[PDB]
Design an enzyme around this catalytic site. Structure first.
Site, short mmCIF file in Angstrom:
data_model
loop_
_atom_site.label_atom_id
_atom_site.label_comp_id
_atom_site.label_asym_id
_atom_site.label_seq_id
_atom_site.Cartn_x
_atom_site.Cartn_y
_atom_site.Cartn_z
N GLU A 221 1.57 -6.20 6.43
CA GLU A 221 3.00 -5.81 6.31
C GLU A 221 3.75 -7.01 5.58
O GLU A 221 3.30 -8.10 5.57
CB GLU A 221 3.66 -5.45 7.68
CG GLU A 221 3.02 -4.27 8.44
CD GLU A 221 3.06 -2.93 7.71
OE1 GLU A 221 4.14 -2.64 7.12
OE2 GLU A 221 2.06 -2.13 7.80
N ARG B 207 3.94 11.15 4.24
CA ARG B 207 3.53 10.38 3.07
C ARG B 207 2.32 11.07 2.41
O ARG B 207 1.42 11.54 3.10
CB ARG B 207 3.16 8.94 3.44
CG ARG B 207 4.32 8.22 4.11
CD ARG B 207 3.92 6.79 4.46
NE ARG B 207 2.83 6.73 5.42
CZ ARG B 207 2.29 5.61 5.87
NH1 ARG B 207 2.84 4.44 5.58
NH2 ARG B 207 1.20 5.64 6.61
N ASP C 278 0.80 -1.24 0.00
CA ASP C 278 0.00 0.00 0.00
C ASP C 278 0.83 1.28 0.00
O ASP C 278 0.33 2.37 0.29
CB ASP C 278 -1.08 0.00 1.19
CG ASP C 278 -0.45 -0.10 2.58
OD1 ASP C 278 0.80 0.13 2.67
OD2 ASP C 278 -1.15 -0.54 3.54
N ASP D 231 -5.67 -1.14 3.86
CA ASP D 231 -4.53 -1.60 4.67
C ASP D 231 -4.16 -2.96 4.13
O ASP D 231 -4.94 -3.93 4.22
CB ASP D 231 -4.97 -1.70 6.13
CG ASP D 231 -3.77 -1.87 7.08
OD1 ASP D 231 -2.69 -1.42 6.67
OD2 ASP D 231 -3.96 -2.53 8.16
N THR D 232 -2.98 -3.04 3.52
CA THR D 232 -2.39 -4.35 3.17
C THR D 232 -1.61 -4.87 4.38
O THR D 232 -1.13 -4.12 5.27
CB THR D 232 -1.44 -4.24 1.94
OG1 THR D 232 -0.51 -3.15 2.16
CG2 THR D 232 -2.28 -3.88 0.62
N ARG E 244 0.98 6.76 0.33
CA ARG E 244 0.29 5.71 1.07
C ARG E 244 -1.16 5.68 0.55
O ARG E 244 -1.84 6.71 0.47
CB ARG E 244 0.26 6.09 2.59
CG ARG E 244 -0.62 5.16 3.47
CD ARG E 244 -0.06 3.72 3.45
NE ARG E 244 -0.73 2.95 4.52
CZ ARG E 244 -1.96 2.40 4.45
NH1 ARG E 244 -2.75 2.55 3.35
NH2 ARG E 244 -2.39 1.67 5.50
C1 LIG Z 1 -4.06 5.40 5.29
C2 LIG Z 1 -3.78 6.45 6.39
C3 LIG Z 1 -2.78 6.16 7.30
N1 LIG Z 1 -2.52 7.13 8.25
C4 LIG Z 1 -1.61 6.80 9.37
C5 LIG Z 1 -2.42 6.22 10.57
C6 LIG Z 1 -1.44 5.18 11.14
O1 LIG Z 1 -0.70 5.89 12.20
P1 LIG Z 1 0.09 4.88 13.22
O2 LIG Z 1 1.41 4.66 12.41
O3 LIG Z 1 0.39 5.77 14.38
O4 LIG Z 1 -0.42 3.49 13.42
C7 LIG Z 1 -0.48 4.80 9.98
C8 LIG Z 1 -0.92 3.53 9.30
O5 LIG Z 1 -0.03 3.33 8.16
P2 LIG Z 1 0.55 1.96 7.75
O6 LIG Z 1 -0.57 0.95 7.56
O7 LIG Z 1 1.32 2.23 6.50
O8 LIG Z 1 1.43 1.50 8.97
O9 LIG Z 1 -0.66 5.85 9.00
C9 LIG Z 1 -3.17 8.36 8.24
O10 LIG Z 1 -2.92 9.23 9.13
N2 LIG Z 1 -4.10 8.69 7.29
C10 LIG Z 1 -4.40 7.77 6.34
O11 LIG Z 1 -5.30 8.10 5.55
CA LIG Z 2 -0.09 -1.62 5.95
#
Ligand SMILES: Cc1cn([C@H]2C[C@H](OP(=O)(O)O)[C@@H](COP(=O)(O)O)O2)c(=O)[nH]c1=O
Ligand SMILES: [Ca+2]
EC number: 3.1.31.1
Length: 129
Positions: free
Chosen positions: A37, A75, A15, A34-35, A29
């Protein structure tokens, strides 16, 4: 919403994709998904699926939503398209990502993606097997 140009730099995982946007590198991103890891079940499968999709496309495009365009990590948050086909949707339709991170104000394609997820669940694909 509208599509804007980007040029692929590297697929990263299921993702996240690095792409040149307005002439600068950025890590995108994918919105609303959510894919797993890479170290998790279906992670390597999600990574390979997104990689093939973006690497094989003649063009990629990014589409921001109405709300936040970047997250707290810097991102870009977008819908990505590979020759007009949305990657975010395709991952969900194949059971390689769950609809997730659906924040009010940045959720234009939520219903499109939930419909995909329901279809993937029906067919017991990947994550739903
Ligand atoms: C998809 C998405 C992720 N995020 C943030 C929330 C999560 O914070 P936390 O890292 O504190 O868990 C993290 C999840 O991304 P990843 O799934 O790439 O880890 O990215 C956003 O803020 N907005 C978004 O639209
Ligand atoms: Ca992910």
């Amino acid at each position: 919403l509208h599509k804007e140009p980007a040029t692929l730099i590297k697929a990263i995982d299921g993702d996240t994709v690095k792409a040149m946007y307005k002439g600068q590198p950025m890590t995108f991103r994918l919105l609303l998904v959510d894919t797993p890891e890479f170290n998790e079940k279906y992670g390597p499968e999600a990574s390979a699926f997104t990689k093939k999709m973006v690497e094989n496309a003649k063009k990629i495009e990014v589409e921001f939503d109405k709300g936040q365009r970047t997250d707290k990590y810097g991102r870009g948050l977008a819908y990505a398209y590979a020759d007009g086909k949305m990657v975010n949707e395709a991952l969900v339709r194949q059971g390689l990502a769950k609809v997730a991170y659906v924040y009010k104000g940045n959720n234009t394609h939520e219903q499109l993606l939930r419909k995909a997820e329901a279809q993937a669940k029906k067919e017991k694909l990947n994550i739903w097997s």
